[PDB]
């Protein structure tokens, strides 16, 4: 397939600010 | 999309999707690696609405293992132990040095927690 995406995919960041 | 709760063995199929995913991670965030969380049999941990995390690759393994021990608020005394794709590095290395040892051809890092080791 192709995919045609505008945000990105799924997949939960655990980066602060800090 | 919508959230599911399957083992590895769902993305192990689509080749071609696990890669497109883990190029497209790869170029939105090279300084973070994408990480599977899974917990292992035995174990006697709380579950936590957590199965796909993106953790930055300069992480010390000793702190990435306290921040996880905390947030699954374990009794001090209670006995944890971490497996990245069947293997177990020292607290001493970072999510970067085992990232590199397993790099492979969907560029996906699986992580297993348990409390104790058992197959």
């Known amino acids: ?18 | 999309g919508s959230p599911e709760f399957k083992f590895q063995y769902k993305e192990d199929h689509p080749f071609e999707y696990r890669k497109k995913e883990g190029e497209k991670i790869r170029k939105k965030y090279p300084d973070r690696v994408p990480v599977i969380v899974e917990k292992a049999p035995k174990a006697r941990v709380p579950d936590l609405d957590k199965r796909k995390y993106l953790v930055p690759s300069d992480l010390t393994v000793g702190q990435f293992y306290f921040l996880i021990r905390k947030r699954i608020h374990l009794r001090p005394e209670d006995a944890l132990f971490f497996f990245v794709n069947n293997t177990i590095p020292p607290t001493s290395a970072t999510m970067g040095q085992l990232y590199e040892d397993n790099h492979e051809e969907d560029y996906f890092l699986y992580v297993a927690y348990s409390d104790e080791s058992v197959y």
Do not use: R
């Open chain 1, 1 to 18: 397939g192709a995919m045609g995406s505008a945000s990105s995919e799924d997949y939960i960041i655990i980066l602060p600010e800090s």
